[PDB]
């Protein structure tokens, strides 16, 4: 996260860290949506251009964390994966269309003050809050700038959703209805963005109607970090919600 600030304790209790077993390293962010399901970006697990193809036994999920590198004894919970489900029409060949994946935990995680699931939006929540100008929040342990290096603790930044035509005109990549972009424009003064290592983490909004936090997006891609006239792109969670439900309902 670039131009963000340290998160407060238990500020984002659905935040999950995807961690490689060996070598031991931070792969991506993710989010807790129930006691046994974690949501992330497909490209965190599968991306053939870079010879990335992780299976269940290659990763661990770390939940309820704050510090990036420390083992938070008696606070964080580490979980093994039972199975990974990547969207059948995830387009890694072209533009990361439908960049979403679900991960089923081997055992359910116990909720606490630092571990708690976020809600998934329904059609009305998406309709009311996914509007240009409305702000969401992104969290992660990713890079602090493009190229300190990486933060000591979880970072947070609030960003406004950007008009679809402006998103489209900022890049040469073909944008789809399964993505939305966010960030400040060059003349808006304020800055901020996700960066490398933040992928798969959640873009959330707090509903003013029922005061619940909803995950509207997943950090997907960007061309650099916090570059003027460029925006971060996120997977449109509500648009892929029927696929989410089907996986959870069937498995």
């Amino acid at each position: 996260i670039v131009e963000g600030s340290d998160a407060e304790i238990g500020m984002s209790p659905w935040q999950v860290m995807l961690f490689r077993k060996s070598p031991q390293e931070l792969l991506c962010g993710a989010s807790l949506i129930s006691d046994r399901w974690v949501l992330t970006a497909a490209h965190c697990l599968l991306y053939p251009p870079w010879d990335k193809n992780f299976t269940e036994n290659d990763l661990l999920v770390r939940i309820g964390k704050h510090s990036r590198t420390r083992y938070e004894r008696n606070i964080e919970k580490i979980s093994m994966l039972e199975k990974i489900y990547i969207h059948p029409r995830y387009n890694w060949r072209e533009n990361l269309d439908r960049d979403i994946a679900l991960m089923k935990l081997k055992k359910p995680v116990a909720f606490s003050d630092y571990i708690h699931p976020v809600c998934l939006p329904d059609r009305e929540t998406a309709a009311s809050l996914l509007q240009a100008g409305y702000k969401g929040r992104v969290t992660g342990w990713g890079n602090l700038k493009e190229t300190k290096g990486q933060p000591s603790v979880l970072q947070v930044v609030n960003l406004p959703i950007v008009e679809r035509p402006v998103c489209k005109d900022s890049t040469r990549i073909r944008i789809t209805d399964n993505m939305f972009c966010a960030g400040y424009k060059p003349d808006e003064g304020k800055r901020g963005d996700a960066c490398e290592g933040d992928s798969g983490g959640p873009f959330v909004m707090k509903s003013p109607f029922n005061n619940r936090w909803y995950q509207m997006g997943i950090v997907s891609w960007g061309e650099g970090c916090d570059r003027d006239g460029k925006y971060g792109f996120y997977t449109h969670v509500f648009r892929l919600k029927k696929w989410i439900q089907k996986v959870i309902d069937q498995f």
């Binding site: 077993k21 390293e25 661990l60 420390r70 083992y71 580490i78 093994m80």
Partner: peptide, 11 residues
């Protein structure tokens, strides 16, 4: 080095 070691159960 960077990351503190996880308890032996998981890794």
């Amino acid at each position: 080095g960077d990351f503190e070691e996880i308890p032996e159960e998981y890794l």
